[PDB]
């Protein structure tokens, strides 16, 4: 009677052998783009705002320090544990991205180009995704596992080890993917979710940059700057490639952070959050669920630091105050300010995201903490409350696209590599800086009246195309990056690339302790805190194959 235990089969399911069949293959491709909108969490955004509170840009926020207590530890650099659930989380999650990319490659690789004249184009897409994941995994941890054999069987995974490659050799493997993506992506994607060739380039460069500040030793301190790495950053940022895909700078900065201008000509590659789309409440950007202003009732995380509000001050010559900005807090009526502030930090006495029927105040309705973490709001990931694109599920989320690569990044990175080459192309790097700066200059759309109605005195001026010292050109480069990327989670990562993590962060820790009291007992341990630890649960479960990070053992 064996004709009896075979009668039943799985319901609503593809079993495993069938997934390899090709009719399911564009399903797999799409499923791998999806997770980037559908696999993050309130506490573990794939924008990594959570783990940029370490930077001198932002405070945790919320009720008090007892709320999300493990992110307070990070913010101050004390109490961080190799077992903290939040870190083991971000690990597990970004490797969940990869499963989808490799499942897709395990079938893409087994197709027929004659039958599928888009095989190489969609292999570039999956490898490009897999890159994007390893890159953020490298930023957050340094000593990552490289999972890049799409045909690897489940039990081969037990013997994987994060030491298999060296530091340069891991960056190189993260390059090897974007390089393939560049050599096989179309110059335009009629579906903007897919990266264009220029998108795989910018990343390819960005990867070489972080590879250029070599930490070829045992600890996280710099061991030299590689010029062959930098020559590659100057290569794949050439405007002749970026023209070939239609990319450039927007007329007005604010356009990169408004739902009305998703996918403009500065959005080199972005996650496509969407609503009214069949999903329970939307493929919304649920990762910014904590950083919605307290006026909605929760939760006032991701609050911008005064140190950032001040770094927009300018002299009467329209330049940053490179050595005097933090002495006295930004005073609206006396100081010349950079316009980029009013798109990054919503300040008290001002409208919350241009909607002047929501003016920010110093009260229960705008600080969940009674002023502990301040009275400032991050504007970039949040929107107008009257938007038809903001819903409430568990937290408040929108459909605002999250950009991974802004063309400004391309320009500044290019300027960075040029300056660091000191081959007389410093002037060219300056000229690139002036493209980004002169843009922010005119960006007074939506805020032109501010001069009369609030007394704000805009004044930003580009630098003079003369000679500059390599230490001097870096100084300005760093600053443009500081003002151009406020609250975009790049900031902490930038200092670790530069290797001045300990020096800058501790100096922020003393200046800011008079203004925020959570920063009193804080302190950056050098050669340890440049990178999160490797999760104990993971090292534990590798039965000897994993190695901890320096200074965590």
């Amino acid at each position: 009677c064996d004709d009896f235990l075979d009668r039943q089969v799985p319901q609503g399911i593809v079993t495993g052998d069938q997934i390899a069949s090709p009719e399911y293959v564009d399903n797999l491709v799409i499923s791998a783009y999806a997770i980037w909108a559908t696999g993050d969490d309130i506490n573990s955004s794939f924008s990594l705002w959570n783990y940029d509170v370490r930077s001198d840009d932002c405070y945790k926020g919320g009720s008090g320090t007892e709320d999300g207590g493990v992110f307070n530890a990070l913010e101050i650099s004390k109490g961080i544990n190799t077992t903290d659930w939040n870190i083991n989380d971000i690990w597990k999650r970004l490797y969940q991205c990869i499963t989808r990319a490799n499942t897709a490659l395990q079938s893409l690789d087994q197709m027929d180009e004659k039958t599928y004249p888009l095989k190489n184009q969609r292999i570039a897409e999956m490898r490009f995704l897999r890159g994007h994941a390893h890159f953020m995994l490298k930023q957050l941890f340094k000593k990552i596992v490289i999972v890049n054999d799409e045909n690897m069987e489940p039990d081969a995974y037990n013997e994987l080890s994060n030491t298999t490659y060296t530091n340069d050799e891991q960056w190189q493997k993260i390059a090897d993917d974007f390089q393939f993506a560049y050599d096989n992506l179309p110059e335009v994607q009629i579906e903007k979710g897919r990266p264009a060739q220029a998108a795989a380039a910018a990343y390819l460069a960005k990867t070489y940059l972080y590879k250029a500040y070599r930490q070829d030793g045992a600890d996280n301190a710099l061991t030299g700057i590689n010029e062959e790495d930098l020559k590659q950053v100057v290569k794949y940022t050439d405007p002749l490639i970026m023209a070939k895909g239609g990319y450039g700078l927007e007329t007005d900065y604010s356009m990169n952070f408004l739902p009305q201008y998703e996918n403009g000509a500065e959005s080199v590659w972005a996650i496509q959050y969407s609503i009214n789309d069949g999903t329970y409440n939307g493929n919304l950007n649920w990762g910014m669920g904590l950083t919605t202003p307290q006026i909605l009732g929760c939760c006032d995380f991701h609050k911008p630091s005064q140190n950032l509000v001040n770094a927009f001050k300018t002299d009467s010559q329209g330049k940053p105050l490179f050595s005097t900005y933090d002495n006295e807090n930004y005073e609206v009526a006396t100081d010349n300010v950079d316009p980029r502030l009013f798109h990054t930090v919503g300040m008290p006495g001002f409208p919350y995201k241009y909607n002047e029927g929501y003016i920010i105040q110093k009260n229960d309705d705008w600080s969940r903490s009674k002023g502990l973490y301040g009275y400032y709001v991050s504007l970039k990931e949040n929107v107008d409350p009257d938007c038809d694109c903001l819903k409430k599920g568990s937290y408040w989320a929108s459909s605002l696209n999250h950009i991974v690569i802004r063309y400004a990044d391309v320009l500044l990175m290019r300027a960075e590599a040029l300056i660091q080459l000191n081959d007389g192309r410093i002037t060219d790097a300056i000229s690139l800086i002036n493209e980004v700066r002169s843009r922010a200059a005119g960006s007074t759309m939506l805020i032109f009246n501010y001069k009369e109605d609030y007394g704000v005195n805009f004044k930003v001026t580009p630098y003079d195309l003369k000679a500059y010292a390599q230490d001097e050109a870096m100084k300005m480069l760093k600053w443009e990056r500081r003002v151009e990327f406020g609250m975009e989670s790049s900031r902490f990562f930038d200092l670790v690339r530069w290797g001045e993590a300990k020096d800058v962060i501790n100096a922020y820790y003393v200046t800011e302790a008079s203004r925020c009291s959570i920063y009193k007992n804080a302190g950056f341990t050098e050669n340890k805190n440049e990178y999160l630890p490797v999760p104990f649960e993971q090292i534990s479960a590798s039965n000897g194959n994993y190695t901890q990070n320096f200074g965590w053992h």
């Binding site: 609503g12 399911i13 399903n27 109490g79 739902p259 069949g278 999903t279 409430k392």
Partner: protein, 806 residues
């Protein structure tokens, strides 16, 4: 000969304890204490507490007292309370139950007819349950002692409303300062920085209409056939059908910061569970005077299919259950459903033999198959021999007297475990589009707006891995060898037994989560290793009577066992799962043993800190963790075996007393010398040991070590756990020894000479009580030590009843 059996029962049910939480008053103390301890100014708190405080001459901080405004609120819409939040959502429970059964039996055929009713108003507010049942059994002898056909039948109807998931637990970390109702008498809730957590009582209201309805038919029909003498085969077929329907109403809410944005919705759920069985069984037996046999052979098929589906609709214009059906919706919708199933087949047989009621023996073999597995290993065979020896019946231990019975059993019996996921063996891919709720995000959805249109229609979907398959999975086998002694002494007044089991489980089935690089869906049902479990049980009782007709029977029990893991795949020992928290492989240790740091009290002195090994966030008032390294730093290698859930022994005792028509009977159970490990102490002993800030906390953290209170084991109050106090430490292990009066019951039996006056036979009233009193050790911080992960006990039952029996 017709028999009637009537029963009736009222039962009251009450919580008698709970984890004491903060007063709205105490809460303000503790927050201030944590503020000043941490040396930051306690009048910049975000909750609006007003402290006046100062220094006590030694130079230490002291609280003078506390004023809150009348309203928690810049606009006076929410008022401060002292809500006893657990009391607001708790009730006394009352059970009503009746059962009537009629039974006609002829020497031709017989028939039974039951009718029962049970109704259970629960100990939570706005939750009830009731249940009708009717039994109809009968059989028919179609040829005198040759051929018979029979039937069995039972029908149930059930209706419940259920507490949402852990409201009690949500009811204890909502601050008592939050008011049930607000100013206008609406529903109340947090505001401002008060913790984001919804009025349990509101929730209980909004959920009072989510009621389901459930029906069940089960029973069998059989024909038993008996050719010639002493032999009879019989087949039976039986079935079991069940069905559950419910509407789940979502209504809107604005309760301070707790919004819903006005979402209304209903979900109509349906679930069907269908099981059927057919067997056939031949049974000969012989008995040539002094010599007895029982042989038995049979087979039995079972199949289960079940399925469930769901219709969900948004946006209603009338927020009631009369209007809120899906047809009446005006917004977006969703549909859900799936089913799973399995089947089992069983061939088997039994041996039974005896001499002159002296030397016995029985053998059993069975072969079992299951849908769950691949064809490779689908069956497996379980033999089982046991034998015995009634030894007083022997023709030489006859003089002995004083003892009346002494047997001597011994079993060796394999047995199979099959209960796992119906889809154990598949790499499962599912097309998760994203149609389903999820807390915080983590949809894990295969949909994505590939075109960048922000959507406005159906989106490209995909597939996603839910599991990894192993086509090598197989049964699990327990080899249990038994051995013991049945005995009975002085004129059958002293009785007992004495067993020694030795279970041994082989190829244990669990579902193993995946290594983290493996990624999504890495998770699979494996067979991992073996485990041993052997112990000794001892039962002994004495019964007698007295002059003044007092009959009594005290029966006691003492148990003890040990348990050891014998073998684990390296990957599975390395990751914990069976113990050792992924620091120390659990082979050669007890199932569930844990490993963590060991806590050496509190630093009471900067010197204690200083001539202690280096500790990260150690200061005066934090917990001092020892250096098992003995290497001067504490890092993570400094941890050994701290938990071991095996009891030292376990014991029980039953008491029966009978006197002057009365009927007393008690039941005591206990365990001596166990460990216990829990989390509750993160809620009772720290301000800052949880992920969300400002929830309500326990009551003994008021006793925190401070300058003004040394010699306290509870570490100091701080706003941010910097000694990682909530690592896995001996702090969290307590003694859970205990002793528990389970049931106790008194009963009066009307004497038979006057029960008949109103035509009966047995008329008896009774009173009982389950879960009456417990006895814990002084080293346990409380709330029922045999379930230490709960911050509340099992509620007490008290029952009045009567059993009529015409």
């Amino acid at each position: 000969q017709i028999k009637i059996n009537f029963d009736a029962s009222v039962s009251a049910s009450m919580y008698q304890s709970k984890m004491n939480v903060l007063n709205t008053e105490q809460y303000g103390r503790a927050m201030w204490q944590a503020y000043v301890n941490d040396g930051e100014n306690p009048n910049g708190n975000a909750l609006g507490y007003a402290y006046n405080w100062g220094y006590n001459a030694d130079g230490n901080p002291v609280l003078y007292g506390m004023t809150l405004s009348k309203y928690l609120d810049s606009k006076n819409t929410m008022p401060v309370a002292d809500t006893d939040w657990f009391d607001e959502i708790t009730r006394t429970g009352v059970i009503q139950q009746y059962n009537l059964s009629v039974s006609n039996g002829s020497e031709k055929g017989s028939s039974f007819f039951s009718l029962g009713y049970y109704k259970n108003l629960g100990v939570i507010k706005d939750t009830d349950f009731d249940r009708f049942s009717a039994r109809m059994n009968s059989d028919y002898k179609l040829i005198d002692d040759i051929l018979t056909i029979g039937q069995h039948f039972t029908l149930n109807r059930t209706s419940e409303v259920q507490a949402p998931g852990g409201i009690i637990e949500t009811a204890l970390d909502i601050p008592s300062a939050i008011p049930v109702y607000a100013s206008d008498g609406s529903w109340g809730g947090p505001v401002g920085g008060w913790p984001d957590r919804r009025n349990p009582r509101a929730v209980l209201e909004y959920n009072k209409d989510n009621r389901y309805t459930y029906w069940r038919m089960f029973g069998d029909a059989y024909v038993n056939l008996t050719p010639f003498k002493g032999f009879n085969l019989r087949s039976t077929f039986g079935l079991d059908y069940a069905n559950k329907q419910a509407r789940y109403f979502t209504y809107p809410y604005q309760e301070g910061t707790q919004t819903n944005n006005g979402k209304s919705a209903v979900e109509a759920k349906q679930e069907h569970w269908t099981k059927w069985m057919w067997n056939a069984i031949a049974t000969y037996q012989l008995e040539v005077g002094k010599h007895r046999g029982d042989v038995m052979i049979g087979m039995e098929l079972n199949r289960e299919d079940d399925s469930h589906f769901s219709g969900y609709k948004e946006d209603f214009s009338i927020l009631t259950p009369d209007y809120m059906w899906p047809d009446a919706g005006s917004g977006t919708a969703q549909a859900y459903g799936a089913g799973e199933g399995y089947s089992l087949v069983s061939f088997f047989g039994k041996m039974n033999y005896s001499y002159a009621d002296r030397y016995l023996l029985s053998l059993t073999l069975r072969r079992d198959g299951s849908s769950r597995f691949g064809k490779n290993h689908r069956y497996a065979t379980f033999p089982s021999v046991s034998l015995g020896w009634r030894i007083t019946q022997e023709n030489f231990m006859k003089e002995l007297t004083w003892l009346d019975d002494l047997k001597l059993r011994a079993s060796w019996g394999q047995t199979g475990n099959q209960e796992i996921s119906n889809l154990a063996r598949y790499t499962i891919y599912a097309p998760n589009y994203g149609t389903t709720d999820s807390f915080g995000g983590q949809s894990y959805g295969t949909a994505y707006d590939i075109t960048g249109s922000n959507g406005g229609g159906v989106l490209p979907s995909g597939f996603k891995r839910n599991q990894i398959g192993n086509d090598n999975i197989k049964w699990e086998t327990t080899t249990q060898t038994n051995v013991g002694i049945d005995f009975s002494l002085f004129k059958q007044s002293l009785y007992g037994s004495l067993e020694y089991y030795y279970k041994k489980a082989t190829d244990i089935l669990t579902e193993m989560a995946g290594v983290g690089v493996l990624g999504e869906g890495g998770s699979r049902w494996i067979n991992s290793g073996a485990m041993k479990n052997q112990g000794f049980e001892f039962n002994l009782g004495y019964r007698n009577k007295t002059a003044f007709g007092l009959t009594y029977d005290l029966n006691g029990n003492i148990s003890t066992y040990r348990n050891e893991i014998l073998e684990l795949p390296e990957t599975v020992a390395a990751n914990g799962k069976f113990g050792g928290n992924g620091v120390k492989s659990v082979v050669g240790h007890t199932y569930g043993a844990q490993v963590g740091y060991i806590a050496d009290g509190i630093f009471k002195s900067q010197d204690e800190v200083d001539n202690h090994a280096t500790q990260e966030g150690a200061a005066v008032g934090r917990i001092r963790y020892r250096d098992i390294d003995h290497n001067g730093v504490i890092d993570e290698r400094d941890q050994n075996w701290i938990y071991d859930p095996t009891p030292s022994f376990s014991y029980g005792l039953n008491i029966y007393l009978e006197y002057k028509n009365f009927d007393l009977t008690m039941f005591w159970q206990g365990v001596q010398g166990v460990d216990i490990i829990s989390d509750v102490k993160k809620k009772s002993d720290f301000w800052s040991a949880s992920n969300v800030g400002f929830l309500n906390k326990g009551t003994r953290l008021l006793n925190a070590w401070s300058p003004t209170n040394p010699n306290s084991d509870i570490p100091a109050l701080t706003r941010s756990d910097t000694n990682n106090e909530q690592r896995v430490s001996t702090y969290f292990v307590e003694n859970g020894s205990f002793l528990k009066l389970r049931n106790i019951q008194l009963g009066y039996t009307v004497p038979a000479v006057i029960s008949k006056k109103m035509r009966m036979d047995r008329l008896r009233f009774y009173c009982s009580a389950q879960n009456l009193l417990t006895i814990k050790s002084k080293n346990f911080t409380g709330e029922d030590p045999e379930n230490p992960n709960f911050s509340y006990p099992i509620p007490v039952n008290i029952t009045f009843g009567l059993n009529i029996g015409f």
